[PDB]
C-alpha cells in the first residue's frame, strides 16, 4: 500500500492511445511509456479485485457467544487507513474514463453484499468514500439513491422504531450511507429531500447502533457544510479528467508541483450550504434540546437510555457544526490577576462570518446541560453513559471550533511522515508534490482554527469548569477519569482560571468539613495531581497558589475522610509528592527590570512601520508600575515566609499520620533559598530533626542543614596577585615563574602567613588570568573564634545544639547506623554537612566531639568508620580559612587519629578512607596540608599487619596525590624512590595497587 500509493501519486493513470497516433512529440523512451499505459485500467481493476478479497476475507468472526467484539484492532485500523490512503490516491490520480469503469466495480460490490458493520463496515464504506471524493457528481448519482431507497424500505415499513436488534441490511445501509455523505458539501444540496427524510426516521430508533450510524450521518452532513477544506488532491491543478487529449499526459510524471500557481480548489460554505446547516440544526438539535430541557426541570422524566440517545444528537450537532457557533459572553473579573497592560484575546479570521444575531445555539446547549446535569447528579447518580456524553459536550462547548486538537496533531505527524520520506533534498522547496502542498495549506488553515492563544476567563467559563469539578469528584471512577481530562484541558485554555479554582478544589481537602465522601476526597486529589503534561494544579509557579496547595496536602491526613488504608490513595500521595519534587523550580522574589531597558521605550516609540497605536505616553504611570512591582516583591517575600510558617504548623501538628509529615518535610526542603535566609522556626526545625527516629526525615535534615550553613557563610575577602612580583622573574606546564605552586621544601611551619596559598589546583598551569585572585592576608578575613555575643542572634541557634552533649551524642549515634549493608558508601552529602559546620564555626564544636572522634576510629564496624570519615574530611576542608594556631591545633590530635584509622583499615572501609582523604585534598594547596603528605607517605608498604592493609594504605595515598595533580613533583619522586626497591618483592594485591599508583 505504501508502494503503490507512492507511485500513483506521481504518474497519472490515463490511457495514451489517441496520443499513440502520428505525433512527433514522443521520443524513443516516451513512446515506450504510452504503449504501456494500456495496463492502467488493468491495474486499477486488478487492484480492486485484490482488495475485495482483502476485505471479504477479513470480516469479523463472532466466536464467543457471550461477548461482542466491537473494537477494530490497531492492526486492523491501519489496514482501513492503509486502504483509505492507497486507494483514494489511485482513484484520484485517474482519468474519468478509467474512473467510471472503476466506480461500477465499487458499486456492484458494496451493494450486492451485506458486511458486518464493525470491521468490514468501516472498511468497505471507506473504499466507497474514496469513490465519492474524486467525482461527487457521478458517484452520488447511484449510491445515495440506492441506500435511501432501501433504508425507507427496511425501516419504516414495519414498526422497527422500537426494536432490540435491527436487520443487518438496514443496519448496513446506514453506515454505507453515513460514511459516504462527506463529499464536498456543495454537491450534497441536490439530495436535501432524501437525507432529511431518512434522518427524520432512523435517528430516533431504539437500537444503540441504529441511531449512532444515524448520528454519524447527521455529523458528517454538518461537517461537509461548514468546514473549509480542499476538494481535490491531484498532481495537476486542472485535473486528469477535464481536458482529455488537450495536453499530453505522459509529460507530467515527474511534476515538481509549484507552490505558486498551485491551482488549489476550496470549499467555502455558501449561504445555501449554511442555511441547510442550520436547518438540520433547527429540526434535530432543538427537538432534542426541549426533551432534555423538560427532563432536567422535572416535567418530562425520560428513561435512562432516552436521555442517552438524545445527548448523542446534541453532541454530534455541536461537535460537527461548531464552526458556526460563537463561544460565549460574560467577562468574569475582580478576582483574577490585575494588569497595567492589555490582556485582550487574539482573534483570527478563519473564514466565516457567523452573524451572531439569530440563535447562538452554543449558549442554549450550555444552559440545557447545567439544568440537565443538575438533575442527573441528584436524581440518578448511577447513569454512567449519560455522564460520559455530558463530559464530551462540555469538552466541546468550551474548546471546539471547526477542527479537533488531536486530529490536527495526527495529520501534522502524518504529513511529516510523508514529506520527509519523499523530498528532493538536492534542490529545495521547488520539488514537493502537489498532494503534499495542498495538505500543508490545509494544515495552515487547521492551525489557525486552533490557535486560540489568549482567551478571557468569562462567567460561563467560571460555571462550566466548576460543573466539570463536580464530575471530577463524583461517585464513579470511570466518570471521574473522563471528567478530569476535560477539566485539565480547560485549565490550560483560559487565562487566570487556576487561581479561581484552587480555592474551590481544596474545599474537599479540609479537616473541618462535615460530610465529604471518599470519592469526593480522592477525586479532588486527582485534580491536584495533574497526571498529564498540561497543568499540575498543586505545583503552580506562583506564590499565591503554592501557599494554599502545599499546606492543604499536609493539612489533609491529620483529620479528613482520608482512607489511608486503601492502597490507591497511598500511591496517590506518593505520586503527588513525587511530582512536586520533580517539577518544582525556584520562584523569584525580585522582578526588578533593570535600567537598561531604554530598548523598551525604543520599541514602544518610533517603531511606527506597522505600529498603529498613537498613545506614546507614560508620565507617572511608570511610578505606579514601580510601586506595584515593589508590592509584588513584598507579597512574594511575604507569601514565602508564610509558606514556611504554615508548613511548620502542619508538620508539628498533633495526631498526624507519619506519611503526611514526610511530605511536609518534603515541601520544606524545597523552600531553602539562596537569595534569602530561611526563617527562624525552620532553622530550629531542621537542626532538631537531625535527631529524628525516622531515617528518611533525618536524611533530609542533613541535606537541609548543609544548605543553611551555605546561607550563613560569611563571605571571605580576596585580593589580586601579579605572579611576576613573586617567583622573582616573569609555556604550558611547570614554568620558571611557577615554582611557588610546587610543594617541595619551603612548606610553612611557623610564618604560615605571607605564603600566597593558591587553593584550586588548575591555576597558573597553562597561562595566567587577567586577574589572578587569592584570599587576603592575616585577619582581613572575618574573625573565627567568637561567642554568642558577637553573632547573628537569630540564625546561630545551630550553635546551641552542637554544643549540647546530649544532641551530639545522639547525632553521632544515628550517623553510625547501617542504612544498608551492601549499598553503603562515603556519603558526599554528610560531608557537606560537616564541611559547612567547621568552616562556619571554626572548631568551636571540636572540643565537644573529643570522645566521638576517638571512639569511632577504634571500632571494627564499617558503619562507624564510615561515620567518622565524613567528619575527618569535613574538618580538613573546613580548615581552609583557619588561623595558624588552629591549624596546628587541628593536626595535633588528627595526625595520631588517622594513623590509628589507617592501621585498622578493612575490606568494607578502604573505599570510605579512599574517598575520605582523597576528598580532603580536593581544592586545597599542597602547602596547607603537608601533615597528610608526611603521614600518608610515611610507610605505605612497610606492612605492620598483613598485606591487604598495605594495599589499602597505598590506594588511599593514590587518590590524595592524584587530586593534587601537577602541584607536586617531589612527593611523586619520594614515592617512586620508595617503590623502586619494593616493587619486586610484593604480592598481587599490592602489585595491582603499585601498577595503579
Amino acid at each position: 500500500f505504501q508502494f503503490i500509493a507512492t507511485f500513483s501519486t506521481l504518474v497519472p493513470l490515463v490511457d495514451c492511445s489517441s496520443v499513440l497516433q502520428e505525433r512527433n512529440d514522443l521520443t524513443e523512451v516516451e513512446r515506450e511509456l504510452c504503449s504501456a499505459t494500456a495496463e492502467f485500467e488493468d491495474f486499477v481493476l486488478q487492484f480492486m479485485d485484490r482488495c475485495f478479497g482483502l476485505i471479504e476475507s477479513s470480516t469479523l468472526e463472532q466466536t464467543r457467544e457471550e461477548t461482542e467484539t466491537e473494537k477494530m484492532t490497531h492492526l486492523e485500523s491501519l489496514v482501513e487507513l492503509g486502504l483509505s490512503s492507497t486507494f483514494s490516491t489511485i482513484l484520484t490520480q485517474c482519468s474519468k474514463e478509467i474512473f467510471m469503469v472503476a466506480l461500477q466495480k465499487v458499486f456492484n460490490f458494496s451493494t450486492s453484499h451485506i458486511f458486518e458493520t464493525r470491521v468490514a463496515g468501516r472498511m468497505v464504506a471507506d473504499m466507497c468514500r474514496a469513490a465519492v471524493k474524486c467525482c461527487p457528481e457521478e458517484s452520488l448519482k447511484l449510491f445515495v439513491p440506492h441506500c435511501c431507497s432501501v433504508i425507507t424500505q427496511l425501516t419504516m415499513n414495519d414498526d422497527v422504531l422500537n426494536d432490540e436488534e435491527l436487520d443487518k441490511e438496514l443496519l448496513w445501509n446506514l453506515q454505507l450511507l453515513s460514511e459516504i455523505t462527506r463529499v464536498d458539501g456543495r454537491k450534497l444540496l441536490l439530495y436535501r429531500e432524501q437525507l432529511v427524510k431518512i434522518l427524520q426516521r432512523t435517528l430516533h430508533l431504539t437500537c444503540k447502533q441504529g441511531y449512532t450510524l444515524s448520528c454519524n450521518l447527521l455529523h458528517h452532513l454538518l461537517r461537509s457544510t461548514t468546514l473549509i477544506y480542499p476538494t481535490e488532491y491531484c498532481s495537476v491543478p486542472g485535473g486528469f479528467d477535464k481536458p482529455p487529449s488537450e495536453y499530453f499526459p505522459i509529460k507530467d510524471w515527474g511534476k515538481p508541483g509549484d507552490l505558486w500557481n498551485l491551482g488549489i480548489q476550496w470549499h467555502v460554505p455558501s449561504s445555501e450550504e449554511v442555511s441547510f446547516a442550520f436547518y438540520l440544526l433547527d429540526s434535530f438539535l432543538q427537538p432534542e434540546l426541549v426533551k432534555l430541557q423538560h427532563c432536567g426541570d422535572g416535567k418530562l422524566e425520560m428513561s435512562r437510555d432516552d436521555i442517552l440517545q438524545s445527548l448523542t444528537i446534541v453532541h454530534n450537532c455541536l461537535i460537527g457544526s461548531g464552526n458556526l457557533l460563537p463561544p460565549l459572553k460574560g467577562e468574569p473579573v475582580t478576582n483574577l490577576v490585575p494588569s497595567m497592560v492589555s490582556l485582550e484575546e487574539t482573534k483570527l479570521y478563519t473564514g466565516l462570518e457567523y452573524d451572531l444575531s439569530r440563535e447562538n445555539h452554543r449558549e442554549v446547549i450550555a444552559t440545557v446541560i447545567r439544568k440537565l446535569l443538575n438533575h442527573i447528579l441528584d436524581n440518578s447518580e448511577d447513569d454512567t453513559k449519560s455522564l460520559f456524553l455530558i463530559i464530551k459536550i462540555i469538552g466541546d462547548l468550551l474548546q471546539f471550533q471547526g477542527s479537533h486538537k488531536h486530529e490536527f496533531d495526527s495529520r501534522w505527524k502524518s504529513f511529516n511522515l510523508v514529506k520527509k520520506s519523499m523530498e528532493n533534498r538536492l534542490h529545495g522547496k521547488k520539488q514537493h508534490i502537489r498532494a503534499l502542498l495542498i495538505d500543508r495549506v490545509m494544515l495552515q488553515h487547521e492551525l489557525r482554527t486552533l490557535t486560540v492563544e489568549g482567551c478571557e476567563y468569562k462567567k460561563i467559563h467560571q460555571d462550566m469548569i466548576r460543573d466539570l469539578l463536580r464530575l471530577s469528584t463524583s461517585s464513579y471512577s470511570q466518570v471521574r477519569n473522563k471528567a478530569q481530562q476535560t477539566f485539565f484541558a480547560a485549565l490550560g485554555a483560559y487565562n487566570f482560571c487556576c487561581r479561581d479554582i484552587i480555592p474551590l478544589v481544596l474545599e474537599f481537602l479540609r479537616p473541618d468539613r462535615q460530610g465529604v465522601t471518599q470519592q469526593q476526597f480522592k477525586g479532588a486529589l486527582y485534580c491536584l495531581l495533574g497526571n498529564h503534561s498540561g497543568v499540575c494544579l498543586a505545583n503552580l509557579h506562583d506564590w499565591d497558589c503554592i501557599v494554599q496547595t502545599w499546606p492543604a496536602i499536609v493539612s489533609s491526613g491529620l483529620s479528613q475522610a482520608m482512607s489511608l488504608e486503601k492502597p490507591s490513595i497511598v500511591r496517590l500521595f506518593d505520586d503527588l509528592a513525587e511530582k512536586i519534587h520533580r517539577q518544582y523550580e525556584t520562584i523569584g522574589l525580585d522582578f526588578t527590570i533593570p535600567k537598561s531597558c531604554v530598548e523598551i521605550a525604543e520599541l514602544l516609540q518610533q517603531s511606527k512601520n506597522p505600529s498603529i497605536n498613537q498613545i506614546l505616553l507614560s508620565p507617572e504611570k511608570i511610578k505606579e508600575g514601580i510601586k506595584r512591582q515593589q508590592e509584588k516583591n513584598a507579597d512574594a517575600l511575604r507569601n514565602y515566609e508564610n509558606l514556611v510558617d504554615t508548613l511548620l504548623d502542619g508538620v508539628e501538628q498533633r495526631n498526624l499520620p507519619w506519611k503526611f509529615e514526610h511530605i511536609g518535610i518534603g515541601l520544606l526542603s524545597l523552600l531553602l533559598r539562596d537569595d534569602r535566609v530561611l526563617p527562624l522556626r525552620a532553622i530550629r526545625f531542621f537542626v532538631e530533626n537531625l535527631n529524628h527516629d525516622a531515617i528518611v526525615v533525618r536524611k533530609m535534615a542533613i541535606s537541609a542543614v548543609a544548605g543553611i550553613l551555605k546561607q550563613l557563610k560569611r563571605t571571605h575577602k580576596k585580593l589580586t596577585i601579579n605572579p611576576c612580583e613573586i617567583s622573582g622573574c616573569p609555556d604550558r606546564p611547570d614554568n620558571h615563574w611557577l615554582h611557588y605552586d610546587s610543594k617541595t621544601i619551603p612548606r610553612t611551619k611557623k610564618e604560615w602567613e605571607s605564603s600566597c596559598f593558591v587553593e584550586k589546583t588548575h591555576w597558573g598551569y597553562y597561562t595566567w588570568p587577567k586577574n589572578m585572585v587569592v584570599y587576603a592576608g592575616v585577619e582581613e578575613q572575618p574573625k573565627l573564634g567568637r561567642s554568642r555575643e558577637d553573632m547573628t542572634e537569630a540564625e546561630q541557634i545551630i550553635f546551641d545544639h552542637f554544643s549540647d552533649p546530649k544532641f551530639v551524642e545522639q547525632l553521632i549515634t544515628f550517623l553510625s547506623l547501617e542504612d544498608r549493608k551492601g549499598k553503603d558508601k562515603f556519603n558526599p552529602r554528610r560531608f557537606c554537612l560537616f564541611k559547612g559546620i567547621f568552616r562556619n564555626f571554626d572548631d568551636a564544636f571540636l572540643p565537644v566531639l573529643k570522645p566521638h572522634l576517638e571512639h569511632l576510629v577504634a571500632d571494627s564496624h564499617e558503619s562507624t568508620q564510615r561515620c567518622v570519615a565524613e567528619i575527618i574530611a569535613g574538618l580538613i576542608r573546613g580548615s581552609k580559612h583557619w588561623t595558624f594556631e588552629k591549624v596546628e591545633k587541628l593536626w595535633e590530635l588528627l595526625c595520631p587519629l588517622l594513623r590509628t584509622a589507617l592501621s585498622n583499615i578493612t575490606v568494607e572501609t578502604y573505599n570510605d578512607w579512599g574517598a575520605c582523604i582523597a576528598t580532603s585534598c580536593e581544592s586545597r594547596d599542597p602547602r596547607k596540608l603537608h601533615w597528610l603528605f608526611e603521614l600518608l607517605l610515611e610507610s605505605p608498604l612497610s606492612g605492620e599487619g598483613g598485606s591487604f592493609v598495605d594495599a589499602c594504605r597505598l590506594y588511599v595515598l593514590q587518590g590524595g596525590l592524584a587530586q593534587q595533580e601537577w602541584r607536586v613533583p617531589e612527593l611523586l619522586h619520594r614515592l617512586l624512590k620508595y617503590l623502586e626497591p619494593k616493587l619486586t618483592q610484593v604480592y598481587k594485591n599490592v602489585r595491582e595497587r603499585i601498577g595503579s599508583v
Partner: protein, 210 residues
C-alpha cells in the same frame, strides 16, 4: 560460558585457607560481619562431611547448602556398600562430578583417608579437582596463595606452630586484626573435627603478634 558465572561468586565470597601438615590438617575462613540484629549462628562456612572429612566453601551460600547435603549422603552411602570411610579423593571426585550448570562453589575438602594420610583438595567450579599442600579460595585468594608459597618447608615441626604461623598468618594477610573475624577449624588424625572457639582463636593471634 555457564561455568564462568559460577566463578564470579567465588571471587567475591569470603576467603578460605587450608594448609596440610604431617599430622593435622587445618581450614580457616573469614567470618564476615552479619548485621546488627542478625544471629550469626546460621552463617558458618566450615561444614563437616563425615567423621574424617570436612570442607570450606566460597560462593553462593544457597548452592553450597545443596552441595554439602549431597556430599553428606555419599559419605554415608559409601559406608553402606564399602564399610570403609571415604577417601578424601572419593568425596572430592563426587563433588566435582556433581558440579545442567555446575553449582557455583569452590571448596577445600580436607581430612584423612583410612591410612592416616593427610589430604587437601579443591573443587573449582569447572568440574576439576586436584591435590594441594596449601591453598586459598575466596576474595583475596591470589595473594594468600602467594604468601603460602613463601612459607611451607620447616613449619611442620610442631603442629601448633605449623597451623597458626601459616593459617591465621595467611588470613591476617587479607582479613582484619582477628579474633572475631576468623573461623578456624582443625582436625587431628582420627580424633574429631573441632572448631576453635574465639577464646582460643584470640590466644593464637597473640603468639603471632609477638
Amino acid at each position: 560460558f555457564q561455568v564462568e558465572y559460577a566463578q564470579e561468586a567465588v571471587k567475591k565470597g569470603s576467603t578460605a585457607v587450608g594448609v596440610r601438615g604431617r599430622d593435622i590438617v587445618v581450614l580457616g575462613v573469614e567470618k564476615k560481619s552479619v548485621a546488627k540484629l542478625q544471629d550469626e549462628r546460621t552463617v558458618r562456612k566450615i561444614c563437616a562431611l563425615d567423621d574424617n572429612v570436612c570442607m570450606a566453601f566460597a560462593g553462593l551460600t544457597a548452592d553450597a547448602r545443596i552441595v554439602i547435603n549431597r556430599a553428606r549422603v555419599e559419605c554415608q552411602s559409601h559406608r553402606l556398600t564399602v564399610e570403609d570411610p571415604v577417601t578424601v579423593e572419593y568425596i572430592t571426585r563426587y563433588i566435582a562430578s556433581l558440579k545442567r550448570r555446575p553449582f557455583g562453589i569452590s571448596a577445600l575438602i580436607v581430612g584423612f583417608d583410612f591410612d592416616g594420610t593427610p589430604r587437601l583438595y579443591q573443587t573449582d567450579p569447572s568440574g576439576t579437582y586436584h591435590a594441594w599442600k596449601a591453598n586459598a579460595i575466596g576474595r583475596g585468594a591470589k595473594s594468600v596463595r602467594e604468601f603460602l608459597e613463601k612459607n611451607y618447608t620447616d613449619e611442620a615441626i610442631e603442629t601448633d606452630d605449623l597451623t597458626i604461623k601459616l593459617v591465621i598468618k595467611a588470613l591476617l594477610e587479607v582479613v582484619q586484626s582477628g579474633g572475631k573475624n576468623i573461623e578456624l577449624a582443625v582436625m587431628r588424625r582420627d580424633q574429631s573435627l573441632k572448631i576453635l572457639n574465639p577464646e582460643e582463636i584470640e590466644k593464637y593471634v597473640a603468639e603471632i603478634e609477638k
